[PDB]
Amino acid sequence: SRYKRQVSGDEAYLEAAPLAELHAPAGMILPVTSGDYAIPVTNGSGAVGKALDIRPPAQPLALVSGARTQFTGDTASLLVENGRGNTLWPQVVSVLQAKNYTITQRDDAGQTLTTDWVQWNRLDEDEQYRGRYQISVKPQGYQQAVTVKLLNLEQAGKPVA
Amino acid sequence: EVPDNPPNEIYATAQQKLQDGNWRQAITQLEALDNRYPFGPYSQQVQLDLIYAYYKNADLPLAQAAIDRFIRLNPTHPNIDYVMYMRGLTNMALDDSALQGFFGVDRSDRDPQHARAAFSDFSKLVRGYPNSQYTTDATKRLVFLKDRLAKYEYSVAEYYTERGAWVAVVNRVEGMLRDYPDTQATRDALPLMENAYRQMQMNAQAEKVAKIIAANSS
Amino acid sequence: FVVKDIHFEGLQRVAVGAALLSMPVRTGDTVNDEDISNTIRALFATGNFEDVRVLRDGDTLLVQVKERPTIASITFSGNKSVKDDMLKQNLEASGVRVGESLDRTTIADIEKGLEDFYYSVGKYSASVKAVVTPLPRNRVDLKLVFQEGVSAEIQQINIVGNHAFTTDELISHFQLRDEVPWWNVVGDRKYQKQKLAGDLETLRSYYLDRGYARFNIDSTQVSLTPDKKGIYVTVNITEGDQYKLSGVEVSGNLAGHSAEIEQLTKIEPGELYNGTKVTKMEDDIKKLLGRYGYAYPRVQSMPEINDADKTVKLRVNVDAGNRFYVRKIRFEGNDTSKDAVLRREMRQMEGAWLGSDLVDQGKERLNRLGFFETVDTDTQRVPGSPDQVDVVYKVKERNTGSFNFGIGYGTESGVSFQAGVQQDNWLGTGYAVGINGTKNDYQTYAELSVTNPYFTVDGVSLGGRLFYNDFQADDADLSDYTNKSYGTDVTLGFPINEYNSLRAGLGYVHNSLSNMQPQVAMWRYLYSMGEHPSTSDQDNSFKTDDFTFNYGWTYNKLDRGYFPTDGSRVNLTGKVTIPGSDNEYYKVTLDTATYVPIDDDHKWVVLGRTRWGYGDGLGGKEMPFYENFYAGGSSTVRGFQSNTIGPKAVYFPHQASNYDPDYDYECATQDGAKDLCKSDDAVGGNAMAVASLEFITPTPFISDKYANSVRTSFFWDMGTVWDTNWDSSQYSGYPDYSDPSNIRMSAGIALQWMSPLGPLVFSYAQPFKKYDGDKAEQFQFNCGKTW
Amino acid sequence: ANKEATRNAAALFSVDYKAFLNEVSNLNKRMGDLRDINGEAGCWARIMSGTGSASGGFSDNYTHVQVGVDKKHELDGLDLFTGFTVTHTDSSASADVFSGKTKSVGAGLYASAMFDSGAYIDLIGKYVHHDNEYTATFAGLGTRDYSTHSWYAGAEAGYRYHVTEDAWIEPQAELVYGSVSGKQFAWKDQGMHLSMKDKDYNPLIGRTGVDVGKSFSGKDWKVTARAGLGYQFDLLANGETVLRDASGEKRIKGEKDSRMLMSVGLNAEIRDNVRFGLEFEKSAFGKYNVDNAVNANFRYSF
Amino acid sequence: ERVVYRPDINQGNYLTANDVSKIRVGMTQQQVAYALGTPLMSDPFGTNTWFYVFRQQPGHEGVTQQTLTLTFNSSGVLTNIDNKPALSGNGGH
Amino acid sequence: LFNSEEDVVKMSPLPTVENQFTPTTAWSTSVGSGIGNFYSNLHPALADNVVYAADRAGLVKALNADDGKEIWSVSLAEKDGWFSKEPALLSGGVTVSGGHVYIGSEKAQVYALNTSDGTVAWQTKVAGEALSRPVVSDGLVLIHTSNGQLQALNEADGAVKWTVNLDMPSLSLRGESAPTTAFGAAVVGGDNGRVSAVLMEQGQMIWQQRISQATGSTEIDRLSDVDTTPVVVNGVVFALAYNGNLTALDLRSGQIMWKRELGSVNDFIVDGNRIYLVDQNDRVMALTIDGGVTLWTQSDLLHRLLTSPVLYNGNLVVGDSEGYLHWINVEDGRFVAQQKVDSSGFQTEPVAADGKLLIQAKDGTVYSITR
């Protein structure tokens, strides 16, 4: 009968009495100078309590070994560095062909493709996602500069940043 | 009980295990995919979600250990703020979560160690990456934590003025008037310093603290 | 060479980044064969590829990577002596583990490191082999074959040179043994270097504290019987003409305490040297100076010798230090119980000259409270300041409280409800709330409690109680020994000294008898109290209200609060009715315990226990039978039934009660138990004298880690009860209950467990003696209802 | 020529069946379940009833307080949680002539492999014993007592389907073994002490049950619809005694019995400590068939 | 009401007599600190005075207190000492 | 439980019984158990038809070497003492010269008895306990104690003439390095694989030299079970090592003539032209003097605790920890005969003189044997 914590979500930390500074009269200073318990002022700017997303930032999973499957902010990566830079294009066009993804315009004489939006499902939280992915594969050399830019992210039809 | 499969399969099923609130099979698959792929091109991602699992499953010491080794072996990142915030919230959850509070037990007296560490952590955060997305929650929790520590020190000052040893009273309230000179505790405390200057017959000092009580009395 | 690609084919450990960082064949310049050898040697020094076979392809190099990732596992074959954790940490101590890349060129040396660890544990014959196994597309694991011969055996702990004392004496006082008694198995003949060093220290001390101040070890030799089987140990000494002590010369800077120092430097002129007494006198000086405040002095002894006459003189040096060491005393790890709870029991207060003994009184009291498993003092110093200290108590909690229930059964319905919780430090606030009760087909029962043990800050501890107990006993309709009784209490009690306490406070105990069976004892009482019923008539209604004046004492002095290992315990506890009450009795129990440790590590400890009792009437009247002392059962006299020792009631005959069906309620009607004859009840007399004794030995199987929380014990009981008003003249043909000389012993074992339900207990016993009709019980416990 | 010795030996068979087929127990009816438990130990309280419906007409009553820890050693086969168990029986019964009671105790170890989906394949090696104290009113002969033993088997075999969160389908199979005593006496009604000396009974009691457990849920209280069915037989019902009626010698022995029991039990798991659960059984097909028997259980993990 | 038990109470700055008879005017912070200890009750609110208060409470024997206030200067030199034997007014009982 | 927790290496019990001749036991006198199970060097010797044996803890008997009659049986362990007779713990090795039988002790004393009665001729003390068969030469009586202290002793007075010093590692074998003599020059084993030497007149450490890998800090296995006793030849000196990695050298030089670091031999002998010895692991093997070239081996007795071998009537003898006695040919190389006598096992070096053969078991303590 000691310790049975449970922190699946708690809302007692939006109500503490705000810090009312301690005025002082004529003559009697006080040496706060050991102040390390000092909350610096910083503008806003975000959510509080259960309006935040403790859910970790996106970082995708590598399909091929040797793929920097990194995600920061709202952009992903699948950078691969193979022997020649004339191998990934047929594989990705085969994926887009046989896996039945839709794309409006594709200059097949080039490698810059602008697509339509794609939807994914994830029962992790109680929300869903949809967005438009754009892989820009340009052969800087025996490497391959891959970048993905998301133009609109609609949540079940509603664009939200 | 590891099913030897392709890695992204393991991740898909682990993500679905997170989905279902099936944290146990989740941490199982994640732990496996992580330790048996000690240089996977995504070990960062699996580590992060592993910490998330640990925490949300409410078994903290492992979470702290994982966060710490994450800091050690990846001392920079584009996503360090999440690591720091998670360390902080780990501590603050260690602080007071015995649901025995149903009886309304003000838990301000049990040791203020975890609260102190949580304050150090969140402060390091808010002074590191102020314009991040994990800021306003951090500031709110900092306000709360400062108030909590102050209430602990006031509890000890009150007990000493009960027993009698007045010099200890004057020192503990010197503390709560040197480090927390904002909160509600210290404004509830100052009369203790008035009293415990009067008992020692050091009148002039009592008149000083009287002035100070008067000037912030409202 | 212009290299367009550096083939890192199938690494499975490293990427191309760490490769290029650790690359000798870096792009940009003209590579040569020296750089080729550099690449091979760099991959070797990293050791990630079974055969680094670099091949040039026109202008690019490619290494024929052979798979030596990964170490898929670390398989161990029946170590039987060492936990696999030690083996894995000793293996990573050598340099290979899971997830790494194999090192084929080290397996033999790793096995040899295992051999070394085994030499370290006293088991010399040992061989270990490594085997590799294929698995899908990368995995090849290394298992460790094992062959562990036998732990060697100390054959003979010799000693040479000793002409003063006999060899067997020193052998015995050692920590190692070469001859262990079968009938007294203590230790085993196995050898360990740590024990050897400790034994050398012990022998050196043993000669030192005899006068032989110049004694010294000369060498040491430990041979290995050329069979991998036996150990021979020889020790060479030089006794050296014991000396006598001449006179202490304590000198230095005392800071005005010369007197008591002198009184701690008293040596009868002509006393033999005694090393242990030198170090004890030195430590006593340290502690004395550590009381008045100087907590950190430095004191050196120096036995300046004189081999000419062969007598010795002691110089002593002392230093002052400084005082006001305490500035802030904070606790740690007390995450459930309040902070005022702990500071109530600190006899060293902030802002005050550090008194080491005071802090230690603190530690003691914190222990003797009971709420805490372990209490560890400490004394840090604050940097920057010379003479200030922050005492800090590391405190780890324990589960107080309980939840005691159980059903058990008996007669033909399926009803029993004994429940109860005793929280004892309820929510940390220091209180002790205890509420237990039970229902039944007939008997209701309820009892409350609360006792704030710091109703003030001096120590005055106010208590409380309340109890309702209706023994309605509707066997068929009514008139069946109804016994309605309730009442309350208040028990205010202060301390008198650092250990004792007194008590006080009143209690009011309503009671109502109805229609009891006309026995002999109850009727002696009744007839003595004016009210005389019809000798053979079931009907009678006796109701009495009274009041009292409780009072007590205690003496609590232990070393812990739950599983003690030293000290004592007592508490007289009385009662008396104030005039105006409706019966005049007075009783005085007297519990007791005692502990005495056998070991110095406090594992073996002989227990001790007793209880006593009495009762009387204050003029003519008698102690109302409803409060006699029962005795027997768990926790009082093990082995028997509960409340079954002492006299057995008698019965008058009976004819009519309006409740006596055919062969129902055999309670001394016509059908059974006629005019005076002895049944097998347990009515209980007044007096009582229950001794006991135990023997506490460590648990036999559980590692210390939580073998701290179990204590097994053998024991030995006794017991008795009589009736100092039991006439014997007119009741000859019946056992003389008035005779105390009717001890009823027992013996057996016992085991305890501090499980989250609180203290459990289990005990097998045997009634080494009995009397007329004493139901035995060779098994008892308290997770439910007994055997 | 004792034609009522028929009924008398029938009463003896009845007390044999009483003892043994009163002291039988699944892991059900005795701990409810141990699937998905956490903690260290408990207090496996238990109570029952169970009036019989054989040729005599009898009654029942029990109590089965217990205790035992279970360390979590996942070693062999399917999930194995080995555990310890001791028990204490205070049976109480009656009949159409006489009555009796008994105190009793034994060890009750078990396992929780059960395919990890519900089989009851476990290690219930129950060791129980008795010492029956019985009165006798067929001419007031009154007393004849003894000890006895009942060594258990345990595991039952159930291949779970579990197509949803509700189906608990699994068969049962058990077989126990014991012996009673050489109860030797003489019933005296006609001057010459008419004797009966039952050498032993040493039976072998088997059943082949099947379970159709139906799950359920609350916020944090798991309920169930525990129904079941299956055979229950014996193998060696020797029970051959003497007939010393003073008119001659005669040997009459018992035969194997056969009954199909019906069970409509349930279970509850409110507030993960308690596992309260109140069950009910019924039987059919003629021989010592039990009719009104409820079975209330309990447990309190720590 | 009549009372029986209470432990002892100690409040810092032990003081002999000779040591007090040592510190004179003109000294420096460091010197006094070296001659008596570190004053464990300072004065924050303003001027630079130290407070040496010796208060011993012997378990229902009244109360004894030798208050002593040292007032330093701006730079750290000493300018005045105010010594006081057992506190004014009755200590109680 | 206790019985099923041991695992060691095994030993082939008793192969190929061949018993060509008739093994006999003349007498079985019982001088008294005895060496018990403690390892030691008590090898009863023989001179002029008189046998002088000893136990571990007690007496010293004089046996008539034709039938076994006790000429006299003194008891050196002190009649007085502290506990009970103060068991003298005789662990030296009985010897003979003049009229004395030197008997090394374990209480660091070196008795010196008399042939006729037992009147102690003198009795010295020596730093550390003796453990080696004391040797007689030119008056001097060397003894190599268990401290690496070759404290020489004068003969008719127990006078300590000098004391050389040697090293001592931590885990030594039971350091038993008997000395020898050659041309007034003393050769001596050691406890670190270092065959030293000393001029037998003053104590001049002529030269030290490391021979091979002795147990410790370069440890060979814990079964390096050997006697460092060297031997002399016409002009060349052989020696095992403190593990036995055989070596050869000359008196003045010590420059190794060759090396055979494959057989860590234990308690060896030579004769004339060919070595004979017992291996680290019981592999009795011949060898040719001029160079360590094997002649024939044998491996019947692996992990059977043996004793040093003996030449006798063109045959070689060996003992064992099982009480048997395995005659062996001098050429190839297999068994010749077999027997067993005692059931307590042999543990000490037998002897050979006047056709007589002798050995002492742990309990029977004597079995004169002739085939």
UniProtKB/Swiss-Prot annotation, chain A:
<comment type="subunit">
    <text>Part of the Bam complex, which is composed of the outer membrane protein BamA, and four lipoproteins BamB, BamC, BamD and BamE. Forms a subcomplex with BamD and BamE. The Bam complex has the shape of a hat, with the BamA beta-barrel crown in the outer membrane and the periplasmic brim formed by the BamA POTRA domains and the 4 lipoproteins.</text>
</comment>
<comment type="function">
    <text>Part of the outer membrane protein assembly complex (Bam), which is involved in assembly and insertion of beta-barrel proteins into the outer membrane. Nonessential member of the complex that stabilizes the interaction between the essential proteins BamA and BamD. Efficient substrate folding and insertion into the outer membrane requires all 5 subunits.</text>
</comment>
<comment type="similarity">
    <text>Belongs to the BamC family.</text>
</comment>
<protein>
    <recommendedName>
        <fullName>Outer membrane protein assembly factor BamC</fullName>
    </recommendedName>
</protein>
Curated annotation (Swiss-Prot), chain D:
<protein>
    <recommendedName>
        <fullName>Autotransporter protein EspP translocator</fullName>
    </recommendedName>
</protein>
<feature type="domain" description="Autotransporter">
    <location>
        <begin position="36"/>
        <end position="302"/>
    </location>
</feature>
<feature type="site" description="Cleavage">
    <location>
        <begin position="25"/>
        <end position="26"/>
    </location>
</feature>
Swiss-Prot record, chain F:
<keyword id="KW-0732">Signal</keyword>
<keyword id="KW-0564">Palmitate</keyword>
<dbReference type="GO" id="GO:0043165">
    <property type="term" value="P:Gram-negative-bacterium-type cell outer membrane assembly"/>
</dbReference>
<keyword id="KW-0472">Membrane</keyword>
<dbReference type="GO" id="GO:0042802">
    <property type="term" value="F:identical protein binding"/>
</dbReference>
<dbReference type="InterPro" id="IPR002372">
    <property type="entry name" value="PQQ_rpt_dom"/>
</dbReference>
<dbReference type="InterPro" id="IPR017687">
    <property type="entry name" value="BamB"/>
</dbReference>
<comment type="function">
    <text>Part of the outer membrane protein assembly complex (Bam), which is involved in assembly and insertion of beta-barrel proteins into the outer membrane. Nonessential member of the complex, which may orient the flexible periplasmic domain of BamA for interaction with other Bam components, chaperones and nascent outer membrane proteins. Efficient substrate folding and insertion into the outer membrane requires all 5 subunits.</text>
</comment>
<keyword id="KW-0998">Cell outer membrane</keyword>
<dbReference type="GO" id="GO:0051205">
    <property type="term" value="P:protein insertion into membrane"/>
</dbReference>
<dbReference type="GO" id="GO:0009279">
    <property type="term" value="C:cell outer membrane"/>
</dbReference>
<protein>
    <recommendedName>
        <fullName>Outer membrane protein assembly factor BamB</fullName>
    </recommendedName>
</protein>
<comment type="subunit">
    <text>Part of the Bam complex, which is composed of the outer membrane protein BamA, and four lipoproteins BamB, BamC, BamD and BamE. Monomer. Interacts directly with BamA. The Bam complex has the shape of a hat, with the BamA beta-barrel crown in the outer membrane and the periplasmic brim formed by the BamA POTRA domains and the 4 lipoproteins.</text>
</comment>
<dbReference type="InterPro" id="IPR011047">
    <property type="entry name" value="Quinoprotein_ADH-like_sf"/>
</dbReference>
<comment type="similarity">
    <text>Belongs to the BamB family.</text>
</comment>
